[model samples]
Target: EHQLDYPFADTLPAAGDTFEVAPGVRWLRMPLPFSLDHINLWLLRDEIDGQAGWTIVDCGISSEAIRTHWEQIFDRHLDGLPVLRVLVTHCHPDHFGLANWLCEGGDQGRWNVRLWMTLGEYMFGCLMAAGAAADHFARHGLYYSDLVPAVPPRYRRLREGDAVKIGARTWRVVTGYGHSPEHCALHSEADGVLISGDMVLPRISTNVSVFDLEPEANPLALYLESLGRYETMAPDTLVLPSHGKPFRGVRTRIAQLRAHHDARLEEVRVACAEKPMSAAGIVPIMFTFALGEALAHLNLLWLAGELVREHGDDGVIRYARA
Candidate 1:
C-alpha cells in the first residue's frame, strides 16, 4: 500500500557543512527530482590503503535530471575527484539506478568506478531491468514501459561478510531482509557509523510487502527479524539512511520500527477477517498509501517471498501476514 509516513515530510534537513558523525565520515545530500526528493549519500573521508578517492554510499535514480544534479554535485561539492568506488544499498531504482550512468561512460571504458551490491538484489534487479519481471508487474496492472530500456540486466555482486576498503578502513557488509532481498548496510565498528541502506529508515518503517515472486512468505516477520539484528549493534551508532536525516540512536529507531510493523500487521489481520482480499483489496486497508507507491512496495514484498497472497477464482486478490 502507498502509506505516507515520512519522518521529515517531503524535504529533508538541508545540506550541511560536512557533519562528521564519526571521525572520518562526512554526510551529504544529492537532489532528486521526483516524489521522494533527495537521496542521502555518505562520504568516507579517509586515506585508506586500497582506495584513493571517496567511497560514495548510494547513487541517485536513472533520470536525466538526477544525472545533471550529480554532475553538479561532483564538480562543486566533490571537486570532481575520481570516485574510487560506489555502493548501492539495494536494487531499488532510486538507490541503484544511477550506478551504471555514473560508472559507464559513452564509447569509453568503465568510469574508473567499481560497484558493490548484494547478489540477491543484483540478480533480481537484472530480471526487472531485463523485462523478466514485467509480466509479473503487468498481472497486477502496474506496467511501465520507460523502466524497460533504462535499467541494466545485471550488476556486480558483493556477498555478505565481504569487506569494502575505503582508504585504510574496511567496512563490513551486513545484509538484511523484509524490505528488499540482500539489502546491504555498511558498518564500521571502529567508527560506530551504520550506512543503513533501506534496511532501516528512521521515520517510515521501510515498506515490506508481498509480491508475485514468492507469494506465501511473511515479509513483515522477516523485516522485523532484520530490525532486531540491527538493534544488537551499538545503541549510539550514527545512522546515515537512504531517505532520512543522519541521526544517532539506531537502536531506539529499531524499537519504533518494530512497533510500526506490528500495528500494520494487525491492520492486515483485521482486513483479512472482514472479507477475502487480494493484494489490491488490502492495499488501502493496510497503508492508505499512494496507489502507485503502495503497489510498488507490495510488489517487492510479494517477490521477496514475504507476504501471503490468496488469489480468488473470481480474480480478486487478497494479502495477509504470511
Candidate 2:
C-alpha cells in the first residue's frame, strides 16, 4: 500500500471558494446536496484568445446553488470574465448535473459557456498534465473527439428595459437604479422573476465623485429605494442572482441588502458625527462549471510560451532538465 504526500494538509477552503495546490492550478470542493455530500472540481487559470478566464473541470448537482457558486467563484476575481469553458471528465449527474442549464450562458453576461465531453462525449487515455515542477498543472488529462475544448451554448440574455427574446422564453428588463447604477436585471411575469445582480453581489463599493457623471443624485438613496422596486415584484418570485446562493424569501434579503449597507452607512455616519469630514478628507471603503461529454477533443493545455526556446536576439534560450 502506498501513502501520499500531505503538503497542504491543514488548510481547506470555506464555502463558495477554492484551494490551489499549485500556481495557476486550483481545487474546488463543493458540498453536494446529496448524501455523499461533496465533489472537488479542478480549476486552471489561463489566457485564451489572449483573454484571462477560467476553465472549469466539472459541474455537479444541487442545481441553483452550484450554479450560483460558479457565479460567485468566477466573478470574484474575473474583473468581469466568466468561465470561458467547461469540460466534463464524464457525464454523470454528479459529473454532469443539469448540463442543460450550463449550455446556456443567459444573463451570466458572457455567452461563452462551452463544454468538452467526447471525441464526440468520451475522454480517452490521457497524459496531459505539466508533470512535477512539472506535475501537469492540469489533471483529467484526456483526449476529445471534439475539435476545440470550449464549445459554447446557453447564449446571451440582454438588458436595458428591452425584452430578452430567448426563444420559448423572454424576461423583461427590470433594471435597478442608483447605487449599483449600472446594475442590470430582468423579470418574467410568467411566474414572477426579478433578476438582482448586486443583491446577488455576494456577501457584498466605491468611488462616487471619481466616476459619476453630472447628476442631481443620491447614489445611496437610489440603491436603498431600488430594494423597494424589487419589493414591488411578487415577493414569492424566485429571485435569480448572478452571485451567491439563490433564495425564495426575497423580501428578507432585500432587507439584508439594506441592512449591510445601512450598518456600514451608520458606521460612516457615526464617524462623521464624531468629527465631521469633507470629500477630500473622506476616504476608503471596502467591498467585496463542468463537464464532460468526453472523448471530446481529448481534453486541453501545454506550455504557453512562458519562455521561448528560440533566442532571436541571442540572449540564449536557456534551460536543461534539472
Candidate 3:
C-alpha cells in the first residue's frame, strides 16, 4: 500500500486497506507482479430493504494467494456480505480471473460465475486469447504454439450498451482496445463518473500491445479507433481507471496514448527503413529497456500486418520489418 496513484513498486498489499471513491463505492486493491502491480476492483454497496450486499467491478485471480488476499479484504473490510455480481473490465486474468470462483458450478470443474464483459470483447478475447491458431499468427509471419494459454472463457460475458445496476447507480458498459484483448470501461452517465479501466490511464500510458495471439490483426488501428470512441463521451467525466487513481481529462489521456504509439510506430518505421526487421527484431530495437513489454508490441504489430516474423529451420522464429 505504498501509493495507488501512479506505477506501484516494491511490495504488494498485505491486507485490509480500501479506498472510498463514492458514497457506496469502495476500492479494493488486489495483488499482481507485473509492471502493473495491482488491479483495483470497486465494491458498490447495496443499501436497501434492511439488507446489504456488494457488487464487484473487477476481481483478482483464483490462485490461492490471491484468494487469501480477497478473503482477508472481505472479512476485514466488506462487513459480511456476498459479492452479488462482478463487472469485468476486460478478459485479462487480473480483471476476469477470479470471477468464476465467486459464483456457482459448471462443466469441466470451472466455476459458474455470472460475469460481465462486452460482446465483441468476450467473443474475440476467447477466440484469440484461448484458441491461439497458427495460421492466424502466420498471417503476421508469426507461428508460435505457445500463445494458446491466453484464451479461455472465465467470465459469463457482457456487451456494449448493457446496464449494470449497482445499488442505486446505473453504470453503462463501454469498451475499447489496444492494451488488452477487448478492454471495457463503465460510465455512469447519471453521475458523470466513468470507470475508464485501462482504456485511459493517467500516468504510464496503457500499453497498445500487438500480441502474438493475433499477429495480423491491425491492433494499432483498432486501438486508436477504440481511443477515439471513448473520447466522444461527455467531458468533465470523473475517470476511474483500473491501474491508476481516479481523475478527469479522459480525452486528453486518450490523446496521449495516441501520441505515444504514433511516435513509437515512427521509430519502428525508421528502424525498418534501416534494415528488413521482423516485429520481434524491431521490438527490441525500438524498446531497448522493455522485453516483456516488447513481446506485447511485437504481437500487436505482427497482427496488424505491419511486420514480418519467420520461423527458421533452427526452430527459432526471427523478425524483420516487412
**Scored by CA lDDT, what does every candidate get?**
0.63, 0.43, 0.63
lDDT: the better of candidates 2 and 3? 3
Candidate 1 wrongly placed segments (more than 4 Å): 1-21, 46-51, 105-110, 132-156, 288-313, 317-322
Cα lDDT tens digits, model 2, 67-164, are: 68766776664446556666554333444453434555533555546564433122221211111211111212212212122323332323456664
TM-score of structure candidate 3 = 0.73
Task: Tell me the TM-score of model 2.
Answer: 0.37
Please give, for residues 73-114, the per-residue lDDT of candidate 3 as tens digits: 666777766666566787666776665555442112322335
Task: List TM-score per model, in order.
Answer: 0.77, 0.37, 0.73
Local accuracy of candidate 1 as per-residue lDDT tens digits, 165-201: 6665678888888678888998877767788988877
Candidate 3 off by > 4 Å? 1-14, 47-51, 104-113, 119-156, 288-322
Order candidates by TM-score, high to low.
Answer: 1, 3, 2
Model 1 scores a C-alpha lDDT of 0.63
